[PDB]
Amino acid sequence: MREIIHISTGQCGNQIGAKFWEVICDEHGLDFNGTYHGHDDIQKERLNVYFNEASSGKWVPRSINVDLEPGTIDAVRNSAIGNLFRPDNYIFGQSSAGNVWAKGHYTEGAELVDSVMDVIRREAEGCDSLQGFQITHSLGGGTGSGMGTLLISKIREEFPDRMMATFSVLPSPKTSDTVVEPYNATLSVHQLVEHSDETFCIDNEALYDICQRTLKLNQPSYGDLNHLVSSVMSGVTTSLRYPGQLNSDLRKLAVNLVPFPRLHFFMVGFAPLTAIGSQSFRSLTVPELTQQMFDAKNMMAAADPRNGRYLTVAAFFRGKVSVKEVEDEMHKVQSKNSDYFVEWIPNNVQTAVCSVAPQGLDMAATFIANSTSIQELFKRVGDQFSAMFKRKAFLHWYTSEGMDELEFSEAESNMNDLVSEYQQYQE
């Protein structure tokens, strides 16, 4: 379990997926052309995790970019990063599905399937033993929602003992840009909690709040939003490609964070948040990074963590850190904020100390927890889905392809059963 295959689905997944490889190549010192720049003993020995050793000393990633918009792939290969990806994994279509879940699931998304699963079997034979699959999709579109959920059911069918760590994008309940978003988000959870072993809740509303408060960025664009997401995706698989004191595997983050198969929605986070210019005014210490992880203004979710109760928390301290300062500052938060942690599990947060440091920052830390406050985001989507289903609005766009009124009732019923289980363990 040392090779990780990353797959990007949809236009939103391609913008975040392609930007994710730019940060990975910078840590290991890989040029955007193919020839490696600087190799060390802690980086060259772990190049097989996200890259493959081809010919003439060329390292190419195993990214699988599948979408239904030709303008998305053509906008990446013509830049200055498409030379690293193999020109054999980009699989697109002619027609676009738009924001319809029924098109990319069995209508327009059913045209590929065999072509997408063909490149997956080729990468499994070239590697020794697979580990996980990082699928980056979104909830609200047509390709990332319709075809993104169908690909998860096909990988688990052929690889039942493989991890399915997906980075889904949850809708924002504060002024959305689409209309048929609850219809594409409700049907996505019905196919996500039945195959994916773990997922992460990320919304776009909490991204603009961070750039306008801590980062102090005047009118952030779509490029700056990918930096906060790629930093969390790269901060999870740190002990797999770098040694450390208390390492952690992808299966370790599932046993210690998923108490019940129906409860696997996590809350991502990162630290610190130093603005441009205030570098000397901020001290990078262990107690400073701890307060930034348990704060409500630094979370990538639209839910309030103070209202709910925490269950399983996972911390990842990187850089020149000491285990003594980690275990001390961790107990002070649990002892002071005892009302936020449930007494049913005395071990709500574990320790994962790393030894390497990112290129630039001296001390980095991320926050991953599975509190009971995640049910608030599921209630806002359920209220908007039930209000539009009563009037039968925007229904002919799905029933004309092959949908039925029985499938929408089963997807809505599963949304109420998930929220009902979070209230039982919360008490």
């Binding site: 595997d249 964070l257 108490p259 049913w344 574990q350």
Partner: protein, 440 residues
């Protein structure tokens, strides 16, 4: 006797195990490259030094008998890139391609049995080269899947093949206060269910207690795992100090299981390292006989998060090293017994096994410990150890009453009723630990 086989498994086994051989090479003057430079003869690196732990091969080289078996390649591959890469044989390192994480079910039934057929062949070929094998040495880590699952599986297969072998163990019990894992109490009850019915002596150490022995005593501002492994390595070196050298009272490993473990069960001794002094206060200490002896029973110098004053002492074992007087040992222990705090049992009239060692120990350069003239090792068995086992049981009853993490064990190959039998065996051990200790 002669040779002693050392086995290091798990995450803590591969880290602390490297610090044990680092101290052994400094006391015997063994070059890390695998030579005999700086030593020649003398008991500090001669015929009495090459025997035990290490092994004499050809071309003037000396390789140890350590067998590093870890289910994570991110730890074994790091040791190969370090300076201590020429000591042990390259074939002794057996890595894996599937991380068992911290799950006891995978490292005992699925992943634990994939390498079980290969680890038994290395021990069999190594035991044949030992002209008179004494016992074994294990380094467990209760809190994961490799140091708990593979460790309990290897101990069961090794006890059935041999039997009459001093199978030592230096496990690391979880801290009763700050924990490091979520499914940590699950890997603790399942480990003690098979450790009691196979192992003969399991030295327990607490990671939280070492933090107190370095911040208040050593005054270390930022202690890490590089300093915790040095204190535990000095404890293992103090037990086998009478066998690897000379002294007035030679103590064998078979004597630790007689004067401390009279019953077939109950074999969980504690540890309290006394020579704990920093380099800044090295000129403000007398290091007398009665001063170091009184520091053994102090809770501040104990490597186990427990209060021995609330309980009663059953059987102690002191290991005096360096240059000490035989008459001063019998007088310093008598003063402690007359304090009316030890609370000796009625059957044992003494219970203070002493062990005078003539070879003075040393300290690792990566620590704040100076070269002392004497060292005292405390290996006692108190009745307050059941208090630490009670706190672990309380954390297991809360997670089992509502079925917290259960599907991770049943889906791999473990019956749900196994947790009930393991809890009943742990509860029966704690019940008999207080009933016998109340009138011993």
């Amino acid at each position: 006797m002669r040779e002693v086989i050392s086995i290091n498994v798990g995450q803590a086994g591969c880290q602390i195990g490297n610090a044990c051989w680092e101290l052994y090479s400094l006391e015997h003057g063994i070059k890390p490259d695998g030579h005999l430079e700086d030593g020649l003869s003398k008991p500090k690196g001669g015929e009495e030094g090459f025997s035990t732990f290490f092994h004499e091969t050809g071309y003037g080289k000396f390789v140890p008998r350590a067998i590093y078996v870890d289910l994570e390649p991110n730890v074994i591959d790091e040791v190969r890139n370090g300076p201590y890469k020429d000591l042990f044989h390259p074939e002794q390192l057996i890595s894996g391609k599937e991380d068992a994480a911290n799950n006891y079910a995978r490292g005992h039934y699925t992943v634990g049995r994939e390498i079980l057929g290969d680890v038994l062949d290395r021990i069999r070929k190594l035991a044949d080269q030992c002209d008179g094998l004494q016992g074994f040495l294990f380094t467990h880590s209760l809190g994961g899947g490799t140091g708990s699952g593979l460790g309990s599986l290897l101990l069961e297969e090794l006890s059935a093949e041999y039997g009459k072998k001093s199978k030592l163990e230096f496990a690391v019990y979880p801290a009763p206060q700050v924990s490091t894992s979520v499914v940590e109490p699950y890997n603790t009850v399942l480990t003690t269910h098979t450790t009691l019915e196979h192992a003969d002596c399991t030295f327990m150490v607490d990671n939280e207690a070492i933090y107190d022995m370095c911040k208040r005593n050593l005054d270390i501002p930022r202690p890490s795992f590089a300093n915790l492994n040095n204190l535990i390595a000095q404890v293992v070196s103090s037990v086998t100090a009478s066998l690897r050298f000379d002294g007035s009272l030679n103590v064998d490993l078979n004597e630790f299981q007689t004067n401390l473990v009279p019953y077939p069960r109950i074999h969980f001794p504690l540890v309290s390292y006394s020579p704990v002094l920093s380099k800044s206060k090295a000129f403000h200490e007398s290091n007398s006989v009665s001063e170091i002896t009184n520091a053994c029973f102090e809770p501040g110098n104990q490597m186990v998060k427990c209060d021995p004053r609330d309980g009663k002492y059953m059987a102690t074992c002191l290991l005096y090293r360096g240059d000490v007087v035989t008459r001063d040992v019998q007088r310093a222990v008598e003063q402690v017994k007359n304090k009316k705090t030890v609370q000796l049992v009625d059957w044992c009239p003494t219970g203070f096994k002493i062990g005078i060692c003539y070879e003075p120990p040393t300290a690792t350069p990566n620590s704040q410990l100076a070269t002392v003239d004497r060292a005292v090792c405390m290996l006692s068995n108190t009745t307050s150890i059941a208090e630490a086992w009670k706190r672990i049981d309380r954390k297991f009853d809360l997670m089992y009453a509502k079925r917290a993490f259960v599907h991770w064990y049943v889906g791999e190959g473990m019956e749900e009723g196994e947790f009930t039998e393991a809890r009943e065996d742990l509860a029966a051990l704690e019940r008999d630990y207080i009933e016998v200790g109340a009138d011993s």
